[PDB]
Every structure is written in structure tokens, then in C-alpha cells.
Design a protein around this ligand. Structure first.
Ligand code: HEM
Ligand code: HEM
Ligand code: HEM
Ligand code: HEM
Lengths: 461, 461, 461, 461
């Protein structure tokens, strides 16, 4: 099969591809293990095939800068398609070129510090809810599963910061607004379906004309009307929906379908991510009680008498920022960043022909011995205000970099910190016998634990 | 396009087909209206195209007999495929030829009168549940939606008669066993997806190798393990599951996957059907209060003092059998029966080449003036023990006929009658202003009401 | 189906589309008849659907100018895809965007007046061959079929002006170089296959990965090696091949596969076109003997004593230019021009959303009563140096207009005129009884005669 | 992927399959080498996957008998599909079940000894033509390529024994009837296209509805009308066409399209096969001059004075029968026989589930040391009337066995022997320096030589 000669011709190393399958059989241990092995075997750049799709992996920090910043608009502007999307075509994370650029413009003022400081009282109320829910699991000394308790917390923060709907998801697990939203899970890009998509990407057109979508047709049909109800109950009679409604009052405003799609993508974006990361952080705190104590002391110092957190007092807390960042290092939940090269180019001395997918293997670089000492260890001091200067922003990329980076970065860090502050103000977290130490990562296509994290939760009362 | 000449060549009338689409655009008013129009325009036989699939419609009672009985095993043994089925390939209603014949054998003793008489105490307990639920909607004079109250009743009867699980679905609408099972709805064979299947049936192979199934992969993955739990909690420590478990203790026994598929098909089969028919019957009773009174008097006569119904006392009630049958006449929820002609044949003097789909248009014949006087009226006397002899069993076919007829006929009639007896022992049913008189049928691909049936429910107390 | 609402929403008239088929059933009489009917029914602009592909037809000369010239590079740069192309992707007529722009640059100097004046002695020798072949059919008074005699002439001119190979195709109809090249016929975009492509354009990806090509794999595999033989017999030891070989000695030179593709596209481009047009011209001359006499007199005046034609004496002949142009008016063999709108735009006051195919219906405009008197008549005087000023270059477009017009315009007119001069110097052409007067055009997807043109050929000796 | 567990579950050995590809990458050396390796590694039975299609290979002579004879009608009646066939669906070699059984009936009397004895004078005349053509290549001592000279001979015999058309193909290589027929070449079931068919057999439906056929649409459209011309020039005013025309004067007669398809399949069947085998025989004779001398002496003894061969004198020649048979042993051009198991069965003690493809690896068994001494050597004595009794007819299967064996066996052997007799009566055949000794077989999907056979041909004058 062809085009399997491309990397050989350019003199670029990589595992030899099978006809039709390319290298996918080498995903049997997951993107992370494949990426490290490749980084190790082949060095600073390499190439492989997702079916017939050539993928060029790069690790030089200069050349990563060019791809994510300098030549973003001109050359490296879109991600690769992945499956049938339906109307979700209009979602900023999926849209391309000038539609993207216009969307990214219309939504930027929504993620500003000013709007985010306005949303904090809402995210705070549900840290309280979280606490009372944790307390009920802690007065009845039963091991807690974090994904479920943080899931319900994440869910809570979303439903409020995007539509004003206010639910106790953990206690109302069967509210229609909680039921649909809980189906918006991260895509397993190595499950039968998406593997098939990589071998038969000519099948994508087929599904499209059949209205078959990787965003389940019914979750989308539920919110599309849920939004047009809210839209016309507020109109006329502080959340993301309002901020978008206010905006459609670049250019060309925001279409009504265009608004529904962004609403959906934020839910999708903020739900399993926030839930997952918080779990990873509580695992590390529970297996490193010194770090947990140190941070608890920091929180009490800024917030004595279990004082509530604020926007300014959150940004005050340096050790908490160190804990969060180091966790995202060990578990960057995206694992890779990816851009489609839209033209023949040469950058930092290397020819890149049109159509290749440039890939940055985040997981692998966050654990590269050549930039991190004992990269497997949990050492928050790597981010102390002393050492935070020796860290290359193109090697540590948990939100990506450049114009197409994670637009929800600020919000996500602030959301996760408000949960951590409130939770640690009230509770300590200890390993159980049934806790999996050391945590093994899932050999699938998601960064998540093989086994869900379970811990003992104790009242500081 | 070809083969669009087939009917023209055989001298068979029918609407002229468009290339690729055949006649599907003539489904814009539904199978029922198309069938009547065709019966009227073209007479006793006609032909049309579901894409490229030729479909030969027949209405002579002799020739229907040949197709459903005399030449079933030899010629007319399977239905037509309809979409990707996954493992549900093994479900009796879908299986073909000797696999079907063997399955139909292994499950026949499960639907016998003897087993059915044993299941009646279980179906009865949930008529009681139904009552208390109706009473709560009747002491608070709010119009009741029948599909929801009978749905929860149907659901209840199924969960018990197939797995022993005992739930108040109406009050536990969010039990995991109620949540999955409520997704097993009747297929809308004119929704975008299935229309596309008829135009692109070459797409079926494509979806199959992609594990894409019209039976949602997650409902099936939930019950497959739900069964292997029950299976191994009873083994070792009266429902359909047991009767199948006892059977795998023709020939070749029942595979473990083969058992899970039948379990699923019965749920699918008994849930929206029972729920739908009961609604149609209560609509007719409410718009014909004489008939409702007459039947109430019959029930009190057999069952004085609201005596509970039994298997024998149900079969006693002739006017109730007349009401149920007449309703199935006006609304035969399958609408058509269909067999694939597997060979060149000639029956009753007409050549039928291999591959055609012989179709019997049940809806249309149940309302044919040539066999029924005032076919639009609700006249239960057409089935009185006096006139029940002048009714051609190949014209009145609400469960089909012959070896491949509805294996659940007995159970379904008995289930629906036990619900009707208990409900009418306690309540009368009257039209609301918001009730749709006269009921309009859905122009889709299901026999169901355009608008859901709503009635006033009053206590005979 | 969707997107069938687009034109309705924009307030644009057009025939109402069927689901999936759009308007293709309205091609049952050909693009030409559909275009006129539409122009007539709907006016100055209209819209229709090639399946799901929206096609916007326009006839205002200002707005045509914008599309073909002013906004060519920025907005209207590519044609629409049509089927699986294989490596022919690299052919200038098919390539897109900057690949096109670079190719069109590398081949422009090949079609200059200077190169074309150099090629004339070669094209002339085969007008002689043509004559002797015609004379053999004229001394034996048998009606001649023009496509066959002009086909062999066209073939001859190509094989020489592109590779130096010198064959009498008419007398060597079974030379391997004549056999393959004669398979490069114009695509019937309404034959079963291409119709299917319009209804299932999602099938194009499928064929591509199967190396299935609308350019037969074996004709292309024959010339690809035929070229690499010639290439390496001239290297080292006046045709298009040389001019390209000299060029690969914008930028990025011409790839070796890139050269083979252009070679092929010129053959394809020059063979049935030149052959077809010459036939149309000889039909009109034979049914308008005054015009034929007048031109014969002109040729004798410039070229007395049957003097051979030259580059300068060809451009001298004004009545011949009038005859050729008027014929291309009545039969513009492309029928339409087409550009893909690559962005949301507004031109001359009309919104055009991304993805639509702007179409200019050349055939229909060449016969529009609003710009031509008696448009069905053959009146060469419409192009006399007197009236040639009142003709809008955006209404008379037989080679298209703007940067993406027919790069072979000069060559094609010069090739056809040299054939006409030599042929008329020696012969007159008269209708037979078996000649089809009036010529009916083919209801297919090609501009060609229903029945092939047959004429009586007489020696001016 | 699934169903890749089937052979593992049944305890059947075989090479471990890759997802989607099964074992096709093990065809990189051809069916023959794979089959031997497997026979060697795994023994008497084994299993592998052509994509997802399970293929069960068997070598026990009893169990082969069951599959090809005893359970042919009931269980093992069809071959496997292979690609899109169009109307060629009706060709006996491709048709299935009762259509096959009826076709095989209607054509059996055409291949009888009596008809075959009637066709011999026609096949003889073209042995003469063959000779004069060979003599022209032998008086001009140039090495002859056998495929071309025997191709033209084969072609000649076909065109006459199927339609009465009489051509010297070698000297008329560009007659329209010779041009089309020469495109009917053996399918390379490992060329890109057919490999793709095995990985994407769900693509077969797609091509079918696109009228795309592995029998080129134009060769079939040429003969379909070529036949309806001959058909209606003989009607009314000794070949296969006549014998079929006489037959349509089981049951249901032969359709007109059904007749055209058989005509085509015989051409396809008799052209490259006869041409190929004759080449293999002349290679062995030329590298074993003793055998060549011995046979020449036999021919002179039966046919002194270069007497012409007859039907009876051909069957007389035992050493010639030995030479032909031994060659078919070393090169059985089908390589394998194959039947689709249409039901769950057990034969000779082994469970075979429905859908598997039972395969008999002819090539491998013809060279199995366990039944043949020095199986690589060319020893015609293995078939002497002495040893011809120790040869298992289910191990030596160059025409298959049972009801679905090669219907053209008699004709093919007789055709090849008449060519050999005439050729050897007049010429001896010697190796050239450019002859490939030892002949290497093609690693493709055809049994043919890597390099075409070239020999020195000398006049016995
Ligand atoms: C711990 C939480 C999160 C992490 C680790 C994370 C990580 C990422 C990464 C790596 C990217 C790709 C950046 C690139 O390509 O350079 C991304 C993109 C994106 N993120 Fe997040 N993200 C998080 C939370 C969120 C949240 C809460 C939102 C809610 C609005 C969000 C919205 C988006 C969007 C819309 C994009 C695509 C932006 C574009 O293409 O212009 N993310 N995220
Ligand atoms: C009011 C209720 C029902 C109606 C009107 C109904 C109607 C029908 C009809 C018309 C058929 C096709 C018969 C034919 O092709 O001749 C059928 C088949 C079938 N029914 Fe029902 N049905 C009902 C309830 C049920 C229930 C409760 C079950 C539960 C077991 C069931 C199981 C089946 C099965 C398995 C088949 C396919 C049988 C075969 O192919 O052998 N049905 N039904
Ligand atoms: C009577 C003869 C011919 C006629 C009427 C004709 C007509 C046309 C037309 C209408 C176009 C499209 C122009 C547009 O889109 O604006 C075209 C394009 C083209 N023609 Fe011709 N043509 C003729 C002969 C030839 C010949 C002999 C060649 C040989 C080189 C040729 C090469 C091309 C090419 C390469 C294109 C595509 C150019 C591009 O996309 O940049 N044509 N022709
Ligand atoms: C040296 C020449 C030939 C060889 C080695 C050969 C070999 C074979 C083989 C192995 C089969 C499959 C048998 C089986 O599945 O058991 C076959 C089938 C067949 N052969 Fe030949 N063959 C030859 C020549 C011919 C010729 C000249 C014809 C002309 C009529 C022909 C017509 C057929 C047909 C129609 C079938 C399929 C029969 C059926 O499925 O009923 N073959 N051949």
C-alpha cells in the first residue's frame, strides 16, 4: 500500500508499517507507552502511520514553538478529523481555518480573568455541596471513589457555570439534565469504532450522510432544545450561555446552532477532565502525606478558620499551584497535541509535505529524563518559584501552546483549585488496602487509571 | 436503474419507481395510507420498490394461506433483513432457515398454555400495582397519559415474567434495570436512518464490521451481563429465563449467547406493543361508553366483589375477547406481514421469482370495505360468537399466521386482559377536552397515535 | 434530506429537489436542455442540486467577470471534483490552489505564440496525410464519417506535437501507441457510473483506496513507461514533452510523475475536442454552401496555387476565424464552466456561502435571444470585424475566461484551422441522403451529435 | 477483531491472524509456497483467515472425497464469491445451488465424447495453422515465446469451437474479435484490487450497484451483441453456440443472457489455461530431451508419414497422456479447490461450522513427499499403465473432482494433445541460453512462470 514510503524517502526513522494497518498494532499498550518507546528507540524526531495517515512526531523545543505559535495561522491551523461530527462541525475545537479563527474570536472574551472572577461565587457554592457529600461518606467510614464524588462536583460546576441550572447531581443522579450530560465522556480513540475509523477513514463520509454522529444524537437533541428553552425564558425575563447570548447581540455574530455547539463542547471539555485530574491529584496527595500536610498548612495560613476561598486568595497559594502543575506533568490528560500541516513547508531545517499530521508527544516529554530528574517521582518542588524558570514551556504542555491552546485553561485550574481548597480544609485522604499503589495507567486510548481511585476520607473534626 | 422492470415484465400493476429511490417517496403518509391507496388503485395484487427491493403485495385469502402456511418451510421462511444486527442475528424473530426452525423448536414449550397459566399469579400482582398507581392519579383529578401508566405496567410484567426482578417502574423510573429496558422501543422504519438503509442496503455490511447495531450496544451489554449474573445466582441457589435455562439442560441445545438474544427480543416484543395496544383499547372504551359499561358489567358478573381474575375466568369473558380483537382490527400494530421468497415459484397461478418480498398489508385488509361493513367504526359485535365464523383468518391477521406467527400471542392477549380486568374493576375512563377525538394515526413508520392518548380516570368509589 | 433548503432560504429560485437525487432526474434531456429551460423559467440566476451539492447558475456578465477573473485566485480557484483520479490528481486541469497555480506557471511558456509558431510545420505535414486519406475516400465515392477521418487527423497531430512519434493512425489503427491513446475519450457525466458518483460522492474515497481510476489504469501505465522510454532515449541523444523536459531543468520544478500527468491531460484535451469541433464545422459548411464557397475563395486568395498555410497566413484569414468562432457558439463543447466557491462571499450584491458550485451555462448563453438574433441560425457575420465589438466576452465563452481558461486555446484554434485550410483547398463537402439534417444533439452528457456526421466529399479535381 | 477465534476454539492449528488482515501478509510468496509451508508446519489439516473469512485446509483423501462428491449437493455446493460479477452471476462456474444444478444440467450434453469427437476436425485445422506459424519462426532461427504462439493457437481453437468465427489470430492480432477476446485473462487474486476485496468484502455490494465488474464492461458488451448477431444470422440460414442454441429449443430452458454468460466463461476458461499448460509441457520436453524423443517416436508409430491425428488415435497415445498428466501434476494451474460449507456439519469426525471455506491445496499435494517420490522431478512414468493404479484420485486433482469438477476436462485434454501431436510431428524444441532453467514460478496469485518460456525450435526438416 501507498503512501507508506514517505518517511523512508525523507530519511526519517520509524517503525515499519503494515499494509492498511500502518502501525496501529503498536497501540496495544497505549499512546503513552508507544510514544516513550519511540522517543527512546528513534530519538528527537520519528514517523509512523495511523493507517495511511502519516504522523510526524517532534521533540525539539524550538521546532515545537514554530508549529504551535509562529506558523499556526499560516501552516498549522487545524487538528486532524477523527470521526463523523454532524452539526458539531461548528464547535470551535473542531472547526477549521477562518471559521475557527472567527469562533475563537467570538468566545475569547468569555474566558477572561474578569468573567472568571465573576463566576467564582457560583463554583464556590458547589464546593460546599461537595463537602457535605464527602462528610456523609466520611462519618460512615466507607472508602470513597473519587471519580464519582468529583464527577458529581464537576457536573455541578458545569450545569451552573454554563446554564444557571442548579442541581445536586450526586443526590439527583436521575434528573433529566444530569442524565444526558453524564453521557458526554471522553472518546476512547482505541475502542473498536475509532480504530476502524483510522483503517477505514473513507467511512466517515458514509456515516455523515447517515446522520450517525460520535456525539450521540439524543444528548445533542436534548440540549439543543434545552438551550432554546432557557434562551427564550431569559429572553426576556452570569453563565457561559448568557455571555454567548450577549455576544450575538470574526464578525457575522454567533449563529443559533453555532451557540448550541460551543455550549456542548464546554460540557464535554470540562466534565471528565476536571473529574479525572482531581482524582489524580488526590491520589498523589494520599500517597505523599507530607505534601498533603504542607498544602493543608498553606490553606489554613491564607484561609484561617476554614475561611472561604476567593479569586485573589486562590492565586495567592503557591504550593497549591505547584501540586496542580506537577500532577498535570505526570498525567497530561490529552497525552499529545496535533496539527495538520496544510502546505509544503520547511521549519527549523526539515521538509514537511502537505497533509502530514505533526504530533507533539506530551506524555512522553513530561517524563523525559533529558529534561526532568527522576521523572517518575512526584516532586512538586520542580515548580517552586525558584525552579519554575528552568522549565521549557514547549516541553511542559498540559494545555497546549499558542493560539489554539486550551481556551478553558484559566477556568479549569481555578475550578480544580476551589475544589481542592474546600476539600482539604475539612478532610484528610489516606490510602486503603484496596487502593492501587502504585497506580497503573489504562492501556486504552484515555489517560485514566486502570482501576478507579479509592481512598479513605477522614474529618479534620 | 435495474431491476426496476420486474413488475412491468410480469404484467403486475404498481406505482412507477424513481431511479434508486423506488417508491419510498410514497411513504410520506405512512405504510398504512400507501397500502390502502394501492389496494384501492390497483386491486387484488400490486408491486412496488423499496429502493431496488421489489415488494409484491397480495390480498387473496387463498394465496395468503399458501405463503404463511403451506409453503412456509419450503419457500417463504424468512423475513427481510432491515439493518445491522450484531449478535442479535441469533434472535428467533431475525434468524433464518434451520437456525430459525431449531430456535422456534427450543422455545415453543415456553409459550404453552401450561407455562402461561403458571405465569398468571405474577402478572396479576402488577395489575394491583397498576391500580394503586392509577388511584393516585385519580384521587388528584389530573388527566392521565396511558402510555406512561401502561408502559410502567408493561415494563413491570416483563421484568418479572422474564427475570424475576420485581420493580415498581412508575415509581422507580431510574432503577438501572428500568433505565436500560425503557430504551427498547419499536423501530421507526421511516426515520432518516432506516430510509437510508433501504436506499443504501449495501451499507449494512459496512456497519456490521464496525460493530454498529440498531440494538444499542450498551443496552445489550447491560443485560448480557445482567443475565450471566442472574444465571449464576440461581445456579445454584417460573420466568422465561428459567424456562430457557431448564431447556439448555433442533437439538444442539441453546447457546449462552443464543439465550441472551431471545431474552432481549421478548422485552422488545412485549413492551411498546402491550403498552401501545392497551392505549388503543382504552381510547375506544372512553369514546364508546356503552361498550365500556357492557364490559364492566361482564367483569362484575364473572368476578363479583372485585374478585381477582384467573386464567380460567379470563378465557370465560367473551365480550372482553370481542373488545380486544376489534381493537387489534382497527390498529394491527405490525401493519404488514412479510416473507422472502427464497426460490422461483408459482402459487395460485402467479409466477414469483426468487428474491422478491411477498407482503400482506394487514392494516389495509382490516379496513377493507369488501370484507367489513363500516370498517372505520368500532363495533365489537363483529366478533360475537355468532359472527366470529364469517371472518377469514387470512384477512384478520394481527399476530400473523402459520409456523412463523407471533409466538407470544397467548401471553400478550392474557397480559393485556389481566390489565384491563383489574383496571375496569376499579375505574371508568372518560374523554377530556384535551383528548384527541377522533384519534389520528402517526404518519411515521409506527402504528401509534399522532398525539398521545390522555383520558379522565374516575374511581368507581 | 439536508442541505436542500439552502436556495429557498436565500430566496433563490430553482426546481424543487427530491431527497438524495436533488435534480438529476431533470438531466434526462441533457445539461443543455435543462440549462435553457431553467434560464427561461427562472431568469438571470437560479439554483439546483447535483445530489446534495448545491449548484448556483449565473448569467449576468458583470458577475461572471468577478467569478472568472477578479476573484479567481482569492475565491473561485478550483473546479468541482468528479470521480476517483489516482495520480491524475497532479494534472493541471484537476489540481487545486497553489499546486494548480504552480503548475499553470510551469506550463504557460509552453503554449506561447512563439512555441506554437514552431510547432506549425509538424501540424502541417499531417494535414497532407489527412488529404491523401480523404482523397482515397473521395475517388471511391463513398460517404465519409468525419469523426473517424478527423479523429485520425487529431490523433496524428497529438502524437507528434507531444512526443515526436509519427504515425498514420487512420492506416495504422492498431499500432500500440494508437491503440491506447484512442481510449482517452470525453467523460459522459450522465452515464450510470458518474450519475452514481453524484448520488454517492462518499464513494469516491472508496474507489481511491482501491486504485480504481476514471483514467483506465492500463492506458496510464502504458504511457507512463512510454514517456520514461522517450525521456531516456532523447536524454541523451520541439514537442510538448521536450518543452516540459527543458522546463524541469511555482518553482519546485516539475516532478517526473507530474510531467506524465500533463502529457496525458493534453492528449485527453486535444483528441475528441479537436475531432468533434472539426465535425461540427464541416456539418455547417456542408449545409451552408454559400459560406463554404466564400471561405474557399478566401483560402485561394491568401494561398493561391494550393499554397501551404503558415502561422502568419492563418491569422490573416478573417472569414475562417468567423466560421470557427460561430461554430463554437452553436456548439461550445464544454457546455458549462464551473468554479468552487471556497469561502463565504458577496459579489455584485449576492451572498454566496462556502462550498456552492458557481456554474456558467455556456451552451444556453450562446443561444440566448437576449444577446443573439436568431440564435439557432448559422450566421458567421456575427463575428465580422464590424460586429465583433458588440459581443460580450463573458457571454461568448467557448474556452472559458480568466486565469483558469483553456491553456490550449491558441493551439486548438491553430490546429483546427490548419486542418480546415488544407481540406478545403482540395475538396468540397456536400450533404448525403443519409446525412442528418437538421443535426440533433446528443441527450447524453457530451456535446456531440445524436448520429455521427456523414458527408459527400468531392475533389476540386 | 472477530471471528478470529474460531480455529483456536475448535483446536485447529494455523498461523496466528492479524486484526482485519487475517493471514494475507503470508501470501507474499504466493498461495503455493504458503500452502506447502502450512502443510509442512501444521500437518494434515490447518486453518487461516482471508481477512475475516475462515479457511479450513484439508489433506486426507477420505475427507476430500466427502467434500467433493458425497456431500457436494447437500453441503458443499458453491465456491466462494470473489468480487463484483454483474450479469456474469449467471455463469455456471459462478452460479449457486439450484441455478447451478440446472445450468450444469443444460450444458452437460455439450461436453460429451460424441460432441467432442465432432469438434476435432475444427481443432485440427488450427494445428496446421500453428505449424506454418511455427515454421516461419523456425526458418528464421529466432527464439520463440510459447505463450504468444500457443496463445494464438488457443484463441484460434476457441473462436472456432464456440462461434464458427475463423481467424489467424497470430497474423490478425488486431481483428475486433481477436482484440476483445484477448482481454479475458486469469484473475490475479493477489493484485491490489482483489487483496482489497478480501479485506473489504463489504465493498462488493458497493461496486455491484455501480455496475463495476471484474469482467470488463466493454468486452462483455462486445460479445453480447456479437452473439445476438451470430444468433440471428444462423437463425435462420457444430460449435458451442449452436449446441446451446439447440438446447434452448433443470428445465426452464436457457435464457438469452444465460447463454451469453456461458459463452464468455468458456473463452475465459480455455484461453490462458490451454495456452499456459502447453507452455509448461514444452518447457519440460525441452529440458528432458529423452522424454521428447520418446514421445516423438510414439507419435510417428501411431501416425506414420506425419499422418493427421484423429479422436481415436489421440486416445491411443499412452506416453502422451503420461506427459500431459505429469505436467499438470507439477503445475496444477488452479492451485486449490474450494467449497463453501453451507451448514453446520461433521464429516470424517470433524466439526465444520456454517460459512467456512473448505480448501484443498492441490499444488501442495501434487508435490507432497508422502505420496510422490522425488516430487520435484519430471518423471512421466508415474502415470504408466503400471503405476497409474497407485495414484489417489483425491490427491491428484488438476480438474477437481465430483459433480462440480471441470466440465471442460475432456475438451481441454483433447485440445492440448492435438496441438502437441502436430507440433512434435514437425519440430524439436531445445533450450536457449536465454531460457530460464530451472523455471521459477510466479510469486503472484497465478500459476505461471516468473519469466515467459523461450525456446529454440528446429524443423525435423
Ligand atoms: C484539566 C482540565 C483541562 C486540560 C488538561 C485541558 C487540556 C487541553 C488541551 C491540551 C487542549 C489542546 C490545546 C492545543 O491543541 O494546543 C485543549 C483544548 C481545548 N480546551 Fe481544554 N483542557 C482542560 C479543560 C478545559 C475546559 C474546562 C474547557 C471548558 C471551556 C476547555 C475547552 C477547550 C477547548 C474549547 C479547546 C479547543 C480550543 C481551540 O481549538 O481553539 N478545556 N484543552
Ligand atoms: C399485542 C401484542 C403483540 C402483537 C399484536 C404481535 C404481533 C406480531 C406479529 C404480527 C408477528 C409476525 C407474525 C408473522 O410474521 O406471521 C409477531 C412475531 C413475533 N412475536 Fe409478537 N406480537 C405481540 C406481542 C408479542 C410478545 C409479548 C412477545 C413476547 C414473547 C412476542 C414475540 C414475538 C416473536 C418472537 C415473533 C417472531 C416469531 C418468529 O419469527 O418465529 N410478540 N408478533
Ligand atoms: C476546440 C478545442 C477546445 C475547447 C473548445 C476547449 C475548451 C476548454 C474550456 C471551456 C476549458 C475550461 C476553461 C475555464 O474553466 O474557464 C478548458 C480548459 C483546459 N483546456 Fe481546453 N479546450 C480545447 C482544447 C484544448 C487543447 C488542445 C488542450 C491541449 C493542451 C487543452 C487544454 C486545456 C487545459 C489543460 C485546461 C484546464 C486549464 C486549467 O485549469 O488551468 N484544451 N478547455
Ligand atoms: C488445462 C485446462 C484446464 C484445467 C487444468 C482446468 C481446471 C479446472 C478446475 C480445477 C476446475 C474446478 C473443479 C472443481 O472445483 O472441482 C475447473 C472448473 C471449470 N472448468 Fe476448467 N480447466 C481447464 C480447462 C477448461 C476449459 C477449456 C473449459 C471450457 C469449457 C473449462 C470450463 C470449466 C468450468 C465451466 C468450470 C466450473 C464448472 C462448475 O462449477 O460446474 N475448463 N477447471
Amino acid at each position: 500500500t501507498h503512501s507508506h514510503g514517505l518517511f523512508k524517502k525523507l530519511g526519517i526513522p520509524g517503525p515499519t508499517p503494515l499494509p492498511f494497518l500502518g502501525n496501529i498494532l503498536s497501540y496495544h499498550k497505549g499512546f503513552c507507552m508507544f510514544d516513550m518507546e519511540c522517543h527512546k528507540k528513534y530519538g528527537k524526531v520519528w514517523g509512523f502511520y495511523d493507517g495511511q495517515q502519516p504522523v510526524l512526531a517532534i521533540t525539539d523545543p524550538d521546532m515545537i514553538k514554530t508549529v504551535l505559535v509562529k506558523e499556526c495561522y499560516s501552516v498549522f491551523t487545524n487538528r486532524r478529523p477523527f470521526g463523523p461530527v454532524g452539526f458539531m462541525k461548528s464547535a470551535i475545537s473542531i472547526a477549521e481555518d477562518e471559521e475557527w479563527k472567527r469562533l475563537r474570536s467570538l468566545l475569547s472574551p468569555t474566558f477572561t480573568s474578569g468573567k472568571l472572577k465573576e463566576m467564582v461565587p457560583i463554583i464556590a457554592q458547589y464546593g460546599d455541596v461537595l463537602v457535605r457529600n464527602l462528610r456523609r461518606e466520611a462519618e460512615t467510614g466507607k472508602p470513597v471513589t473519587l471519580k464519582d464524588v468529583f464527577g458529581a462536583y464537576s457536573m455541578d460546576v458545569i450545569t451552573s457555570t454554563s446554564f444557571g441550572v442548579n442541581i445536586d447531581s450526586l443526590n439527583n443522579p436521575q434528573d433529566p439534565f444530569v442524565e444526558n450530560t453524564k453521557k458526554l465522556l471522553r472518546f476512547d480513540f482505541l475502542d473498536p469504532f475509532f480504530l476502524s475509523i483510522t483503517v477505514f477513514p473513507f467511512l466517515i463520509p458514509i456515516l455523515e450522510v447517515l446522520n450517525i454522529c460520535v456525539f450521540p444524537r439524543e444528548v445533542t437533541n436534548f440540549l439543543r432544545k434545552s438551550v432554546k428553552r432557557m434562551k427564550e425564558s431569559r429572553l426576556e425575563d452570569v453563565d457561559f450561555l448568557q455571555l454567548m447570548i450577549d455576544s450575538q447581540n470574526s464578525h457575522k455574530a454567533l449563529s443559533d446552532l453555532e451557540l448550541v455547539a460551543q455550549s456542548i463542547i464546554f460540557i464535554f471539555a470540562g466534565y471528565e477532565t476536571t473529574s479525572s485530574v482531581l482524582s489524580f491529584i488526590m491520589y498523589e496527595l494520599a500517597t505523599h502525606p507530607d505534601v498533603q500536610q504542607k498544602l493543608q498548612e498553606e490553606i489554613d495560613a491564607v484561609l484561617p478558620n476554614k475561611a472561604p476561598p476567593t479569586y485573589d486568595t486562590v492565586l495567592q497559594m503557591e504550593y497549591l499551584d505547584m501540586v496542580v502543575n506537577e500532577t498535570l506533568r505526570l498525567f497530561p490528560i490529552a497525552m499529545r497535541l496535533e496539527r495538520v500541516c496544510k502546505k509544503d513547508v520547511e521549519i527549523n531545517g526539515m521538509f514537511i509535505p502537505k497533509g502530514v499530521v505533526v504530533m507533539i508527544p506530551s506524555y512522553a516529554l513530561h517524563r523525559d529524563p533529558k529534561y526532568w530528574t527522576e521523572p517518575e517521582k512526584f516532586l512538586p518542588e520542580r515548580f517552586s518559584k525558584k525552579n519554575k524558570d528552568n522549565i521549557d514551556p514547549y516541553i511542559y504542555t498540559p494545555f497546549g501552546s499558542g493560539p489554539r491552546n486550551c481556551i478553558g485553561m484559566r477556568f479549569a485550574l481555578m475550578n480544580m483549585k476551589l475544589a481542592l481548597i474546600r476539600v482539604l480544609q475539612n478532610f484528610s485522604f489516606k490510602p486503603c488496602k484496596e487502593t492501587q499503589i502504585p497506580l497503573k495507567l489504562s492501556l486504552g486510548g484515555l489517560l485514566q487509571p486502570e482501576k478507579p481511585v479509592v481512598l479513605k476520607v477522614e474529618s479534620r473534626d
